[PDB]
Amino acid sequence: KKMIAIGFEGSANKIGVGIVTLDGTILANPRHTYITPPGHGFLPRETAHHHLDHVLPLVKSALETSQVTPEEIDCICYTKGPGMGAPLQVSAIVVRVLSQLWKKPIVAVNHCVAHIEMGRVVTGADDPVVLYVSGGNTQVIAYSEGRYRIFGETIDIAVGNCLDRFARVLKLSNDPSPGYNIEQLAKKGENFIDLPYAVKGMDVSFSGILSYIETTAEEKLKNNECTPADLCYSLQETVFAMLVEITERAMAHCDKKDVLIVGGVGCNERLQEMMRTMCSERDGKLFATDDRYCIDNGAMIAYTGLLAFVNGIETPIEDSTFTQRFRTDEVHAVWRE
Amino acid sequence: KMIAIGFEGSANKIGVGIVTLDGTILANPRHTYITPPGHGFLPRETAHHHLDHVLPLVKSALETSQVTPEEIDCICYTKGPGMGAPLQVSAIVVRVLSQLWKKPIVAVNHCVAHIEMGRVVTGADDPVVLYVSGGNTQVIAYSEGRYRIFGETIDIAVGNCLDRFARVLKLSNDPSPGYNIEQLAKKGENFIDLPYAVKGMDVSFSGILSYIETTAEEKLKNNECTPADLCYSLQETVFAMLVEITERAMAHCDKKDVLIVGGVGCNERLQEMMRTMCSERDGKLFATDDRYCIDNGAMIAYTGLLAFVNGIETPIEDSTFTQRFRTDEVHAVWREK
Amino acid sequence: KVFNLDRGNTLSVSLFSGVTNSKELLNSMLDGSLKLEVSFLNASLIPDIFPLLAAAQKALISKSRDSLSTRTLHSELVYNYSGSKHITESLKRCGISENTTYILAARFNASPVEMEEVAKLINGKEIDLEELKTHANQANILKHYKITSQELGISSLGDAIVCRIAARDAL
Amino acid sequence: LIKQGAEARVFESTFAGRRSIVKERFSKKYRHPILDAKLTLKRLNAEARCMTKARKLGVCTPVLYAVDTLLHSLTLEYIEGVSVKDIFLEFGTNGVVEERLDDVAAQIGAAIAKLHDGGLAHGDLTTSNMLVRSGTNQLVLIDFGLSVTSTLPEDKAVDLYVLERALLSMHSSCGNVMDRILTAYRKSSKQWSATFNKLAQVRQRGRK
Amino acid sequence: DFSCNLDVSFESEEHALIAYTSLAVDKELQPDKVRRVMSVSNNKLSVHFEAIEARLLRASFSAFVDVLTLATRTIQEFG
Amino acid sequence: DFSCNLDVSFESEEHALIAYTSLAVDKELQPDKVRRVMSVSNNKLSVHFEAIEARLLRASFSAFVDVLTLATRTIQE
Ligand SMILES: [Fe+3]
DSSP: OOOEEEEEEOSSSOEEEEEEOTTOOEEEOOEEOOOOOTTSOOOHHHHHHHHHHHHHHHHHHHHHHHTOOTTTEEEEEEEEESSOHHHHHHHHHHHHHHHHHHTOOEEEEESHHHHHHHHHHHHOOSSOEEEEESSSOEEEEEEETTEEEEEEEBSSSOHHHHHHHHHHHTTOOOSSOHHHHHHHHHHTOOOOOOOOOOEETTEEOOHHHHHHHHHHHHHHHHHTOSOHHHHHHHHHHHHHHHHHHHHHHHHHHHTOSOEEEESSGGGOHHHHHHHHHHHHHTTOOEEEOOHHHHSOOHHHHHHHHHHHHHHTOOBOGGGOOOOSOOOGGGSBOOSOO | OOOEEEEEOSSSEEEEEEEOSSSOEEEOOEEEOOOOTTOOOOHHHHHHHHHHHHHHHHHHHHHHHOOOGGGOSEEEEEEESSOHHHHHHHHHHHHHHHHHHTOOEEEEEHHHHHHHHHHHHHOOSSOEEEEEOSSOEEEEEEETTEEEEEEEBSSOOHHHHHHHHHHHHTOOOSSOHHHHHHHHHTTOOOOOOOOOOEETTEEOOHHHHHHHHHHHHHHHHTTSSOHHHHHHHHHHHHHHHHHHHHHHHHHHHTOOOEEEESGGGGSSHHHHHHHHHHHHTTOOEEOOOSTTTSSSHHHHHHHHHHHHHHTOOOOGGGOOOOSOOOSTTSBOHHHHO | OEEEOGGGOEEEEEEEESOSOHHHHHHHHHHTOOSSOOEEEEGGGOSOHHHHHHHHHHHHHHHHTTOOSSSSHHHHHHHHHHTOSOHHHHHHHTBOOTTOOSEEEEEETOOHHHHHHHHHHOOSEEEOSSOHHHHOOHHHHHHHHTOOHHHHTTSOHHHHHHHHHHHGGGO | OOEEOSSOEEEEEEETTEEEEEEEOOOOSSSOHHHHHHHHHHHHHHHHHHHHHHHHTTOBOOOEEEEETTTTEEEEEOOOEEEHHHHHHHHHHHOOOHHHHHHHHHHHHHHHHHHHHTTBOOSOOOTTTOEEETTTOOEEOOOOTTOOBOOOHHHHHHHHHHHHHHHHHTOSTTOOOHHHHHHHHHHHOSSHHHHHHHHHHHHHHHHO | OEEEEEOOBOSSHHHHHHHHHHHHSOOOSOTTTEEEEEEEETTEEEEEEEESSHHHHHHHHHHHHHHHHHHHHHHHHTO | OEEEEEOOOOSSHHHHHHHIIIIITSOOSOTTTEEEEEEEETTEEEEEEEESOHHHHHHHHHHHHHHHHHHHHHHTO
């Protein structure tokens, strides 16, 4: 019998509830998004208010779409983190109440492992080294001895943060996302501008690059020497070169066959094109899922929760806490072994 | 000498006035809750603005007036009329100040404050007083020791009419929509027909506002007239109608001099037409000025000074602010004596 | 009889009963064969000389400002006495029809010779200007002018007729 | 020139060889030319209509002689009579004749009821307004400048309230006439109940 | 149904009594839906508020904390 | 400095115990400035908040009222 685990994802302004089966099929994936004024980042309090407004209708829509009665749900999975405290605590309260009413065990689930496993079951990849690059994460993950160890990551800031900050500097619209506007404006780019080389060892840095390109943007817009399209083109090409170079170095170090990419920032096309070209040069394949899974959602967490529960490892109802950094390596794989 | 302090918060404008008996303002830090353009004011956010500003505002009033709190003869709050929340904040602060300073609370009406401030500024002894503001469009005459109203809008005030007509046309909100309407009408050159809407000794503005809104919406798309012409025609029509009403008021009570007060008194076309009428009928219009006609604490404090030096007082246990407080209920004991 | 009007103008009046050539008078009015300007009114609709004097003042004002809505000043007068905004119906009812042998003939500032020759032109019996009350058709006056019984109890018919003639333009 | 009103003028002249008065609504300067023409025409029509309707209700009024559209003038019959204020001053100074006062109160109450039942207010029922015709002791009403047409009993109650307030203002030297006028209106009117309820409501409003 | 008591510690008895009396005279807009009573003990001002519904309770306590903040600022300015 | 003690009405005892085992087991934001204790007697809650600052206590009030209404709206079906 396909045992069903109900999971939540609220690590960001994206609220989602997930129901999955043993094969990874999503019986219901309702989801809701929060919008922000341009040039600024969302604050936790109004985000939590939005989460409170939308959490009950999301569960209602999940139970309607999946057409699965809550009794048939076998266990409840809550996203331990990482994520903001308020939506995580709202999800924790809801899962605790649902567990107390339905008498189902609770399990804490990580988010990056969820991304990795859902990408694995979607793209059909066997076991690739994964680059997760987004607004909140930028890391290289490889499986080893039951632990999803980190090989490469950003040293100062996730490049998603740098891209969003520069988009705010360029006053680009937040609808549908600053990243998409940046990508389109770079596609309209004509002039390239040099940027500092800030790759230390096999990792990357972006704070100095972001500061330098912000200064360059201010100087060039003040003097009207170029359009923001050229600025976006330069930033895009430079950061793509750095990221693909460190990806190649990690790929050579890890001694793999093919590589997987995931994340909202991974929605770009110039990256996937040139990096798949160099992968074909390196006798490697590109794995790249659709934008539906690159963004956070509940069915993401639900499948990893199912994997954890089927083995037999549980979690006490009192330990349903959260943390600002729920590191991936702290989770020991037992389903694969 | 005798000095009275008055608080005015019946509208979005907030004022902390401190006055003497001669009619001369000692200090007047007046502040406004500057609403975003295209939007009005609501009691909750206005109360929040008052919460943030009134203590700095009271400190500014004390610094500007340089008058010790003990020198206050009476502390007076605008009882109303007006929206509940700002009057309620004013009630709390005046209660606290009365119980700390050990000073008498006096409830003060708004229209009486306007009339008294205008009369003391212009030196008139007993004229018909026309108080026109955002929420008030009143023609008032002294009679038997009571300020009896004889000309009044039944549906909506002229100031509110101008305001939401401007919002229909989406005018700016600095310093006031009426000022922007006046600036626009300064370029108006064409007359526009408006129906005759004076009955008895009163005027109705809701029908007038609906008609002018319909005409503006019909003419803007058809480019038949400019908004300047609409504003100029509306201004001339409403002020001619008010001339007729106040002339009937002149005839009924047999009055000669004329006083104009309120926000719209800041304009000049009213003064020109009124002085023309006074010259025709051997009257003497008395002029207006901004600091002695806009909503602030000076007039409130002056009416409170009259009430306190006459004898009327209200105990701290009777500090019951009212959303509605008519002018005639105020027994004008100052003038009979 | 000649009676003075405003600004020094005068009007000559002549009432005739038993008119035998009323059809000829109407035909001459239609074709304009008669050279002299003259108006013929159904004299049964007149209680006093005062309404006629008021209509004369109205026609005098119309002529002085040259605002004669109708082709002739006398037709202006006959339309004025009707008190209606419809010229054709006014002429049909208050103006002479084929059933009016009790006819009033008037002229503006007329010389005695003109009135004598007009009297020669008409085959009828001349009557004074005091029998109107005896010959007033009050029933049709109430019918056409909608005079209320309350109006009759506080004022005379002539006053109501004069008020309506004045207030025609007020509607 | 006899008198100049707040909005118009009244003049003395001769109409059609009869003694006459001319109420001329000369163009005031508080209106723009087209605006002034429109309001002068409309209010002239309104005054003529009010006189016609008050005549239709059996209330004696000055007779309208002629209307000059291009001059905005009202010609009215001249009336010989005595003012109510003079009679009441005589009552206060030389003694009140109770039978004359009762007859006057009954007549004015009947006239007020007759005007009120027609759904047309007057608004200026002041002792200077109504006159009593000499010899025939008949009551006449003038000065329709503030006449407004409406069926609301509020207007009738306000009219009666203003009348009694004016009677109080002109001093009680002739005695209290409120009881007499109320009894006359009761004996004359038919919808008097609602009118007196609204009159009492207005009285409580104005007392405060 | 819903209710609780709140305490505030003042410098002396006088400030607690002033706050008690100043907020006491404040009438209640809807006595049929909310109710307030209170006690004073030393410098501790205890306010037992009881409301029927959760949203009304939350709004009432929000306004109550706001006006308490007003009173505290005024007293601290004029201590 | 500031404090409040909610006592809440509930139909059955198990509802109060559900609210306890749901909210109480959760760890609040920061013990340094605020303290929270909660107990259950019969079907009646006794929830005491103590705080240094009224604004922090009011934020806690908002969160607590919202989550309690959430729990009720979850139980009601
Ligand atoms: Fe105002």
